[PDB]
């Protein structure tokens, strides 16, 4: 018996555990699964469970008539926490005859469980009540005869509260006839009280289920609200895609796609005129809207929009929403994103690196290059680590680059923005793989780690007697292509070092200002002394530190690319020029320290 009741108890625990750990569901669904799965271990001819209404406070418009005195105050049963005893749902598990599961939403007081006050008294008090010979009790008007014309008569009742950890009651479980006809004993009280304590702890899983559904709905709303704020409005599209002003349609893009292609190809600037091919390209004369138009031109110039039938309006709006996704930070704004995308296009075309890449590798490479620092907050990964920003808890390593990948994929998920509509599933999988390969490549660390592998590839290819052998040797293995891609993304990310001195000068002042603002945040909020790179007081130390940046980081990748392709020779040459300039400034600072 003792062994039997303990094995029964533990299997109650195990099946209720299994059914709450099958999936997160609401109170009704979890107790339905747990109770129905424990139907064989609850030795009851019937039992039921009424869940109380959980609205502890009421809305002000329902409290108005009481405070106004138009309606008399509710006098009568109240839960110990002070709520009204209102059962919003009952689930009856009839098992003595035909097994049936009657769900009664909003049971009236006519319900055969509620005609007696005992659930109401348990909600009023939270007492565990065992009652025998129901017709003999005078205080509770339990039925003396058949209750549902089936000859089933209530003989014993065991009513228990289910209690949330706050001591607020959530429901009343009423266990009826004991089968054996004996009254409830302390052993069966022990079994039922164990069940009800487990159910009260299992209320945590419903709590969480509601919490996460609220968090999910709030996240989806916040993402859709962000998508509304971020997506280009149709006016922002019309500012580029001037279909109205020339096709005279003015209402809908009902014109054929060839008309949009013509109207865009005439509106986008020529890449020869705006230096979009050269390494020496500078974005300072252009406005950011002109950078959007140049980026759409760059997608045209690789001859991929026409080949895969990329819709012109979709491309234009994905390039405008990409521009809007960058923050207004001092250096990691949209301008740096476009400079990386233009450097990528220059590597593909002028660097002659396209020989190793198909057109669905250049298309994805350029689309990933434009998005590699989208929504940059203005702080390195160290600030994320130290401040413990939600990014640093969401993304463990390469925090911002993973954020930029996740956001670029979220932009591509919307059909209204997806430039990859008319691709096959396997082509879309390829493009997504190369999106990850190109966006997570941009962290400098990974670059430092994989310099050796890229060097081994370039050294092996330098010995090759003919171009065709080197191209075949690269294109046979996917991994060698991925390494070349990652180092192309890193070389584009650092490309400002290779720009002429005027550009390098200004852009380095912008980088230094962003790092000084980051270090002012570190000093003010974290109460830490910043690194001298991030200390404003070491402004005069900036030029010599910049020299240390040139000969440690960039010069390797640009020497390896200049060995790999002769057409990338001038890019390193600009880096060398910039090294000389900063070195002269460091010597002037040395003269300041010399006196």
């Amino acid at each position: 018996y003792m062994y039997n009741i303990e094995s029964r108890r533990s299997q109650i625990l195990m099946w209720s555990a299994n059914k709450v750990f099958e999936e997160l569901t609401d109170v009704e669904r979890q107790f339905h699964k747990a109770l129905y799965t424990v139907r064989s271990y609850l030795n009851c001819e019937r039992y039921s469970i009424g869940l109380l209404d959980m609205t502890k406070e009421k809305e002000f418009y329902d409290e108005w008539p009481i405070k106004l005195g138009e309606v008399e105050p509710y006098k009568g049963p109240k839960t110990p926490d002070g709520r009204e005893v209102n059962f919003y749902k009952i689930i009856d598990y009839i098992l003595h005859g035909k097994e049936e599961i009657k769900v009664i939403p909003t049971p009236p007081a006519d319900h055969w469980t509620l005609i007696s006050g005992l659930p109401t008294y348990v909600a009023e008090n939270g007492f565990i009540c065992n009652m025998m010979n129901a017709p003999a009790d005078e205080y509770f008007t339990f039925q003396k005869g058949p209750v549902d014309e089936t000859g089933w008569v209530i003989k014993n009742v065991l009513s228990l509260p289910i209690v949330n950890k706050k001591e607020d009651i959530v429901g009343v479980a009423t266990f009826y006839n004991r089968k054996d006809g004996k009254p409830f004993d302390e052993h069966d009280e022990y079994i039922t009280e164990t069940l009800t304590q487990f159910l009260g702890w299992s209320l945590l899983n419903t709590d969480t289920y509601d919490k996460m559904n609220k968090l999910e709905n709030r996240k989806d709303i916040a993402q859709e609200m962000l998508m509304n704020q971020t997506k280009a409005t149709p006016e922002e599209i019309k500012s580029i895609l001037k279909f109205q002003e020339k096709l005279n349609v003015d209402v809908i893009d009902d014109c054929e796609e060839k008309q949009l292609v013509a109207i865009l190809k005439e509106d986008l600037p020529d890449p020869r005129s705006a230096e979009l091919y050269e390494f020496r390209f500078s974005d300072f004369p252009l406005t950011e809207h002109g950078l959007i138009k140049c980026g759409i031109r760059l997608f045209f110039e690789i001859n991929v929009v026409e080949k895969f039938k990329v819709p012109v309006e979709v491309l234009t709006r994905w390039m405008y929403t990409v521009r809007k996704g960058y923050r207004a930070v001092t250096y990691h704004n949209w301008r740096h994103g476009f400079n990386v995308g233009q450097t990528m296009f220059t590597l593909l075309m002028t660097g002659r690196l396209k020989k190793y890449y198909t057109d669905l590798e250049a298309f994805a490479m350029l689309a990933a290059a434009f998005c590699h620092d989208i929504d940059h907050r203005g702080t390195n990964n160290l600030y994320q680590m130290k401040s413990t920003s939600p990014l640093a808890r969401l993304h463990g390593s390469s925090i911002l680059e993973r954020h930029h990948l996740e956001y670029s994929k979220t932009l591509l998920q919307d059909e209204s923005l997806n430039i990859f509509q008319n691709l096959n599933k396997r082509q879309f999988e390829t493009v997504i793989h190369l999106f990850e390969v190109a966006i997570i490549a941009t962290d400098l660390a990974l670059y430092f780690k994989k310099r050796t592998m890229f060097q081994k590839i370039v050294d092996a290819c330098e010995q090759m007697q003919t171009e065709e052998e080197a191209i075949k040797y690269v294109t046979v293995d996917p991994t060698k292509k991925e390494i070349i891609m990652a180092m192309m993304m890193t070389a584009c990310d650092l490309s400002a070092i290779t720009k002429p001195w005027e550009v390098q000068s200004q852009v380095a002042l912008m980088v230094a200002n962003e790092f000084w603002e980051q270090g002012d945040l570190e000093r003010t909020v974290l109460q830490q002394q910043p690194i001298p790179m991030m200390d404003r007081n070491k402004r005069d130390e900036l030029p010599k530190l910049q020299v240390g940046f040139i000969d440690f980081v960039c010069t390797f990748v640009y020497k390896e690319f200049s060995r790999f392709h002769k057409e990338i020779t001038p890019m390193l040459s600009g880096l060398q020029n910039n090294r000389v300039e900063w070195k002269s400034l460091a010597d002037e600072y040395d003269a300041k320290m010399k006196v």
Binding site: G126, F127, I128, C129, N130, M131, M132, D137, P161, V163, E167, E193, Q197, N380, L382, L444, A445, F448, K449, F515, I531, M533, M534, L545, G548, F549, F552, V553
Partner: peptide, 25 residues
């Protein structure tokens, strides 16, 4: 009939200095 209250009670050694200096790690 019994009524009861509820029971409830990698990197090189030299590279590490430069990597820390530029905030890479």
């Amino acid at each position: 009939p019994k009524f009861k209250q509820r029971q409830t009670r990698a990197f090189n050694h030299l590279e590490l200095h430069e990597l820390a200096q530029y905030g890479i790690i």
